[PDB]
Amino acid sequence: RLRYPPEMPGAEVKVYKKVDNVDLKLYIYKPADWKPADRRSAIVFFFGGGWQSGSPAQFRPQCEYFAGRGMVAMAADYRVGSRHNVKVADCVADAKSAIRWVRQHAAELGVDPQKIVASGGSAGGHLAACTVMVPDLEAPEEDHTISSQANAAILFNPVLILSRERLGTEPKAVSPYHHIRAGLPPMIIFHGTADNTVPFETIRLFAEAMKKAGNRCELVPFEGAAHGFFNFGRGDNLAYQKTLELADEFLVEIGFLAPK
């Protein structure tokens, strides 16, 4: 089960942000035959936990998988309410910092700065959505001429409508649904139809409005599945395996990954 601080065997650790004397880390899984001159796609995972808890260990299985497939895969730590005096808008700033850091350091990471994927589950899927479509909420001292916007997203039962005391902004400013517009990066979404934490209908409504604006927004329902269905260990790792094979296919389709 998940522990914080996480153990991340085999990952290279880099501090991507220093803020209130906290050193926030990225845990980086490089593929075989990796070289700095490479231009691989990257994927950055944001754990779930209601913006209050959670662990980067959550997406360690997925990191190992996508590293095995030739991406530079990484799990980001970010500040959360039970550990740091933060609100949702601060978590957004951290998620954006992580994407900007990867892009800023793309040359030394062997990464194509235009093939950075944001990903996460629940609150972390909300953060990944924020890095593709929610404006502003940037760390004020960072270089805003380096974009923090990811080039694609892969979302595991995200929160996408926040339409209050722990947000740190007026709710629309952290609500991906309220920033749907044309010209957005492609994404795929996995959600359980029996999710009692985040109602499936909010996600269905989100995807229909994205498609109307011309965006590639694929929603894959998991019939009768509950919140968290996708994680390593839940069930018999069937949905775990299925989301990875569908996410893999999605990355191949958009040109970020080579076919197996």
Numbering used by the authors: 5 to 167, 185 to 281
Pull text from the paper.
In order to facilitate the purification costs, we searched the ESTHER database for a thermophilic esterase, and identified the Esterase 2 from Thermogutta terrifontis (TtEst2) that has been previously structurally characterized, and presents an open active site that could ease protein engineering for further optimizations. The recombinant protein was purified, biochemically characterized, and its kinetic behavior towards different OPNA studied, before performing a structural analysis of its complexes formed when soaked in a racemic solution of the OPNA. Biophysical characterizations demonstrated that TtEst2 is a monomer in solution, with some polydispersity and good thermostability at physiological pH. We determined the bimolecular inhibition rate constants for five representative OPNA, namely tabun, sarin, cyclosarin, VX, and paraoxon, to estimate if this enzyme could scavenge them at a fast pace.
Continuing this characterization, we solved the structures of the tabun, cyclosarin, and paraoxon conjugates. For each of these structures, the mobile region 165–190 could not be reasonably modeled, despite the presence of multiple disconnected blobs in the Fo–Fc map, notably a peak of >4 σ at the location of the indole ring of Trp180 in the VX-TtEst2 structure. For paraoxon, the strong electron density peak at covalent distance of Ser126 was modeled as an ethylphosphoryl adduct. This is consistent with the loss of the ethyl group close to the His248 through the dealkylation “aging” mechanism of cholinesterases. As in all the previous structures, the additional peak of electron density in the vicinity of the three different adducts was modeled as small molecules, a phosphate with partial occupancy (0.7 and 0.75) for tabun-TtEst2 and cyclosarin-TtEst2, and a carbonate for paraoxon-TtEst2, depending on the respective shape (trigonal or tetrahedral) in the feature-enhanced maps. However, the active site of TtEst2 being largely open to the solvent, there are no residues that could stabilize the leaving groups of paraoxon and VX, which are in consequence freely moving in the solvent.
